[PDB]
Amino acid sequence: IFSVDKVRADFPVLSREVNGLPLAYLDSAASAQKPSQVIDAEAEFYRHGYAAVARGIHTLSAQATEKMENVRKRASLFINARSAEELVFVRGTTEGINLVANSWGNSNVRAGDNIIISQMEHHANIVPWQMLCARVGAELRVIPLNPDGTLQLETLPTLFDEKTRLLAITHVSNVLGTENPLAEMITLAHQHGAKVLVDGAQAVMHHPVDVQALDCDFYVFSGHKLYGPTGIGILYVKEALLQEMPPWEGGGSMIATVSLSEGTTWTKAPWRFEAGTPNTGGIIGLGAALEYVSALGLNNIAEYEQNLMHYALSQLESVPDLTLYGPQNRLGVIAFNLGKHHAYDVGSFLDNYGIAVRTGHHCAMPLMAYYNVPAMCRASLAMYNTHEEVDRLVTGLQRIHRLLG
Amino acid sequence: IFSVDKVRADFPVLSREVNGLPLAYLDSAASAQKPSQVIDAEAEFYRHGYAAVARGIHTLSAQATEKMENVRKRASLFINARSAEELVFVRGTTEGINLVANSWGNSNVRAGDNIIISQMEHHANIVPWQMLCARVGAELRVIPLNPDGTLQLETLPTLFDEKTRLLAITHVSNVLGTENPLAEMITLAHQHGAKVLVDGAQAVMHHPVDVQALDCDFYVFSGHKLYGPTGIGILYVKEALLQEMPPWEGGGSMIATVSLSEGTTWTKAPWRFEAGTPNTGGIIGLGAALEYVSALGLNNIAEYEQNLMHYALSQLESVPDLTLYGPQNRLGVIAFNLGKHHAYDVGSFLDNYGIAVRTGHHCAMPLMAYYNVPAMCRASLAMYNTHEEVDRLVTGLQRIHRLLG
Ligand SMILES: *Cc1c(COP(=O)(O)O)cnc(C)c1O
Numbered sequence: 190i191f192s193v194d195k196v197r198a199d200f201p202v203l204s205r206e207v208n209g210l211p212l213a214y215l216d217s218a219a220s221a222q223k224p225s226q227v228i229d230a231e232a233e234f235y236r237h238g239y240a241a242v243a244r245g246i247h248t249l250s251a252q253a254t255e256k257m258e259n260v261r262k263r264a265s266l267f268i269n270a271r272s273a274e275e276l277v278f279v280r281g282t283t284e285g286i287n288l289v290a291n292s293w294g295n296s297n298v299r300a301g302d303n304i305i306i307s308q309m310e311h312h313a314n315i316v317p318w319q320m321l322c323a324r325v326g327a328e329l330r331v332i333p334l335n336p337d338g339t340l341q342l343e344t345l346p347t348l349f350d351e352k353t354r355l356l357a358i359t360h361v362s363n364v365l366g367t368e369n370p371l372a373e374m375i376t377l378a379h380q381h382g383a384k385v386l387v388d389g390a391q392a393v394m395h396h397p398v399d400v401q402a403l404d405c406d407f408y409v410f411s412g413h414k415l416y417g418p419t420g421i422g423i424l425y426v427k428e429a430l431l432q433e434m435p436p437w438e439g440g441g442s443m444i445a446t447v448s449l450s451e452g453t454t455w456t457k458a459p460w461r462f463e464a465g466t467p468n469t470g471g472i473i474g475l476g477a478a479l480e481y482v483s484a485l486g487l488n489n490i491a492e493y494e495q496n497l498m499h500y501a502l503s504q505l506e507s508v509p510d511l512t513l514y515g516p517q518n519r520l521g522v523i524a525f526n527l528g529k530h531h532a533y534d535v536g537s538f539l540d541n542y543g544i545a546v547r548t549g550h551h552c553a554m555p556l557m558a559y560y561n562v563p564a565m566c567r568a569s570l571a572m573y574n575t576h577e578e579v580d581r582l583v584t585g586l587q588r589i590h591r592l593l594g
Numbered sequence: 595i596f597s598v599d600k601v602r603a604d605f606p607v608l609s610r611e612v613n614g615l616p617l618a619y620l621d622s623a624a625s626a627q628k629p630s631q632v633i634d635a636e637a638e639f640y641r642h643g644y645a646a647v648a649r650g651i652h653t654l655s656a657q658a659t660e661k662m663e664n665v666r667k668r669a670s671l672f673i674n675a676r677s678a679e680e681l682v683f684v685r686g687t688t689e690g691i692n693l694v695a696n697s698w699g700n701s702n703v704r705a706g707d708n709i710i711i712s713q714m715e716h717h718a719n720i721v722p723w724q725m726l727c728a729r730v731g732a733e734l735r736v737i738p739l740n741p742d743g744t745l746q747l748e749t750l751p752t753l754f755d756e757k758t759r760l761l762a763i764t765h766v767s768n769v770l771g772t773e774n775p776l777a778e779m780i781t782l783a784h785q786h787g788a789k790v791l792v793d794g795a796q797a798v799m800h801h802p803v804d805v806q807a808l809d810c811d812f813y814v815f816s817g818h819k820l821y822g823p824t825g826i827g828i829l830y831v832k833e834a835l836l837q838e839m840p841p842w843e844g845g846g847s848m849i850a851t852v853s854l855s856e857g858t859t860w861t862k863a864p865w866r867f868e869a870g871t872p873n874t875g876g877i878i879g880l881g882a883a884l885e886y887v888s889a890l891g892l893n894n895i896a897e898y899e900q901n902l903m904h905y906a907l908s909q910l911e912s913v914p915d916l917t918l919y920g921p922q923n924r925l926g927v928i929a930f931n932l933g934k935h936h937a938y939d940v941g942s943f944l945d946n947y948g949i950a951v952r953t954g955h956h957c958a959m960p961l962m963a964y965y966n967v968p969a970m971c972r973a974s975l976a977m978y979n980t981h982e983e984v985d986r987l988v989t990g991l992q993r994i995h996r997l998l999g
C-alpha cells in the first residue's frame with residue numbers, strides 16, 4: 190500500500206512556507222516537485238563522475254556514456270518500448286513534437302493532405318502542426334469537444350479520409366483530466382494508413398503506459414512533470430519509422446562523416462537525432478525519477494490519486510457557485526471557475542492563503558474558447574498531496590465566495 | 595591575484611581517483627568540471643524554490659520567473675550585450691547555431707547565394723550550414739588553414755562577393771587553440787552586407803568577451819564548458835535582427851494567441867524563440883557559474899592559464915617525437931600526436947595513468963584531413979589545472995614513447 194506521509198518526507202519543497210503560511214502545492218500538472226533522491230542523483234553525478242559523453246576513451250567519459258545509455262534503456266522499459274533505440278532524448282514534450290513535425294512531417298505530409306488534432310490539445314500539440322501545414326500546404330482538422338470535456342468521437346468519419354496522414358492526440362488533457370480512448374482511435378487511424386503521435390505529458394505519472402499495447406507510432410513526455418529535472422524529455426518512435434527519418438538538428442555526434450568537399454553522412458537512430466552535448470545532468474536525474482516512481486509503483490500511485498480525486502470532488506460540492514469543467518472520471522487535475530469572479534483573482538486569494546493553483550488559459554486557448562471563458566483555475570492532485578490540502582482548497586474557495594460575493 | 599589551490603578546493607571531482615590513481619582532468623575543452631557553488635545553486639533551487647515559470651500567479655512560480663529573467667540579464671552583462679532581450683536560452687552552442695540557420699537562414703539565404711565558414715570549424719558550425727545550403731540552393735565556401743593553424747586570410751577577397759550573406763566563424767578553435775581576428779573579419783563581412791555568426795564556445799571561459807566591441811550579429815556559447823550545468827547555453831542576436839526573425843520551435847509560451855480558425859500569432863523576442871517549459875534548473879546553475887567566474891575575474895583566469903600554457907609548452911619540448919598542431923600563442927588546448935602511435939593508444943595509456951585527455955577527431959574532421967591525420971590527442975589546461983598535472987602529462991608521454999618506441 191501507499192503511505193503519503195513517507196512519500197512527502199522525500200520532497201524538501203513541501204515544508205516550504207509561502208506568505209508566512211505552509212505551502213499547499215496544487216500545481217504539479219504545470220511542473221512537479223522533485224524528491225531528494227532525484228535532486229541528489231544529479232548533484233552526485235556532478236560532484237563525483239562528471240565528464241563529456243562522446244564515448245570518450247578516458248574513464249570518466251566512458252562511464253558517463255554508459256550511465257546515459259542505461260537511462261535510455263530504463264526509460265524504454267518504463268513505457269514498454271520494444272527497444273532502447275526507439276527512444277530519443279529531447280528537451281521535453283514540446284521539442285519532441287517539433288522534431289516529429291519537421292523530420293517526419295516535412296517528408297510525409299504534402300500539399301492537399303490533412304492532419305487531425307483535437308480541440309483539447311495543449312499548444313505544444315497544436316502550433317508545430319500549424320507550422321507544418323503552412324509549410325507544405327496541408328489542412329489541420331479538429332476533433333471537437335462535448336460539453337462534459339470528452340471528444341465528439343462521432344465526427345471521426347468526416348475527418349479521416351485517404352489523405353489523412355497523421356492523428357496527433359493527447360493521452361490525458363492537462364486542463365480537463367480527460368483520458369482519451371487511444372487504443373481504439375489508433376486502430377481507426379491505422380486503417381487509413383495514418384500515423385498517430387500521442388502527447389503523453391500528463392499520462393506517464395498517473396498510471397502505467399505501454400506503447401506496444403497502444404501501438405502508437407510516436408509518444409512524447411517531459412521529465413519535469415514526472416518528478417524529474419527540467420530540460421529533459423523522451424520521444425518514442427517505432428523503429429521502422431525512426432530508421433527512415435532524416436535528421437533535424439545538425440552538428441557533432443549525429444554525423445558519421447563530415448567533409449567540406451564530399452558532404453556529410455549521418456549516424457544511426459536514435460543518435461542521429463541528438464546533436465551536440467546531451468543534457469547529461471538532466472538524463473541522470475530523469476533516470477533517478479523513473480527509479481523512484483517505479484519503486485513506489487504506478488498502480489499504488491493511481492489508487493491513492495484516484496481516492497484523493499474522489500474525495501476532492503465530493504468536498505467541492507459544498508462550494509457555492511462552483512463551476513467544474515471536464516468529466517467526472519478525470520485524472521490528475523480539477524479545472525474550475527468560482528461564480529463570476531475572474532480566475533486570476535481566485536488564484537490570487539488562494540496564493541495569499543499559501544495554496545498554489547494555476548490560473549489563465551493553461552496553454553489551451555482553443556479549449557477556453559470552446560467553454561466561452563477567458564481563463565480557468567486548475568488544482569492538481571498529485572501523489573504527495575493530502576486530504577488536508579484538499580480541505581484548505583475547499584475552505585479557501587468558500588471564504589473567497591463569501592468575501593467577494 | 596589567482597590562487598589555484600583555493601579554486602581547486604571548490605571542485606569536488608578533482609579529488610576523485612581513476613584506476614586507483616589521482617585524477618588529472620585535462621579535458622575541460624570537451625566539458626568543464628563544476629564548482630560546488632554551481633552544483634548547490636541548482637540543487638537548492640530544486641529543494642526550496644521549484645515551480646513552473648509561466649509568470650504563474652502563485653508565489654513560487656512568480657519568483658522562479660524572476661530568477662530566470664535575472665539570469666538572462668546577468669548573462670547579457672557578462673558578454674556586454676546592450677540589452678537582456680538580445681539573449682535567447684538554448685540547449686547549447688549547437689542548438690543556437692541550428693536556430694539561426696533555420697529562423698534567420700531560411701528567410702535570408704537564397705538560391706545562388708553563398709555562406710563562408712572556415713576549415714577549422716567544429717561540426718556544430720558546419721553541418722547546420724550544409725543543411726541550409728542544401729535546402730535553399732546556396733554554396734558553402736571555406737576559408738582554408740595555414741600549416742601553423744591560423745586562417746589563410748589572403749583568400750578572403752576570392753570568397754566574399756555581393757552574394758555572400760553570412761560568415762560563420764569560430765572565436766577560438768577547440769582543437770588548435772587559435773584565436774581568430776574577429777573584429778577585423780567582421781568589418782570586412784559588414785562592408786559586403788554579410789552578417790557574422792561567432793562560435794564562442796571556447797572563448798567565454800578564457801577571457802572577457804564584448805559583443806558590442808566585436809559588433810558580431812550572432813554569438814553562441816555553452817554553459818557546460820563555462821563551469822556550468824549541461825543542457826543550457828546562450829544565443830546572442832542583435833536586437834534589430836532578432837526582432838525580424840520568425841519562430842523556429844512552436845508551442846506554449848512563444849505564442850500571443852492560438853486559434854484553430856484564425857491561426858496563431860507570436861509573442862515578442864526573445865520569448866518567441868523559447869518554446870515549452872524552459873530548463874529552469876540549468877538556467878539557475880548557469881547564473882551561478884557566471885557569478886563564480888566573475889568573482890574569480892576573467893583577467894586573473896587568463897593570466898594564470900597563459901602562464902600554465904607557457905610552462906606546458908616549455909616542458910613538452912623534452913618529449914621525443916612529439917608533434918604539436920597549432921600556433922605558439924594558443925589558448926586553452928594543446929593538440930598533439932606522439933611519433934607514429936595512434937592517438938587512441940596514447941590516450942589509453944594516459945588514462946591508465948589517471949590522466950584524462952581527449953583523442954579522436956574532436957568533432958573537426960575537416961581539420962584532421964587538413965593535417966592528413968585520422969586523429970589527435972588534446973590536453974586542456976584550465977584554471978583549476980596545475981604545474982604538477984602538466985608534469986604528469988610530460989612524464990606519461992615520455993614513458994609511452996620509451997615503452998612503445
Ligand atoms: C563545444 C563546442 C561546440 C559544441 O557545443 P555543444 O555544447 O556540444 O552544443 C561548438 N563549437 C565549439 C568551438 C566547441 O568547442
Ligand SMILES: *Cc1c(COP(=O)(O)O)cnc(C)c1O
Pocket residue numbers: 218280281282283284311313314359361362363388389390391411414846869870871872
Ligand atoms: C506540459 C504539457 C506539454 C508541454 O510540455 P513541456 O515540458 O513544456 O515541453 C505538452 N502537452 C501537455 C498535455 C502538457 O501538459
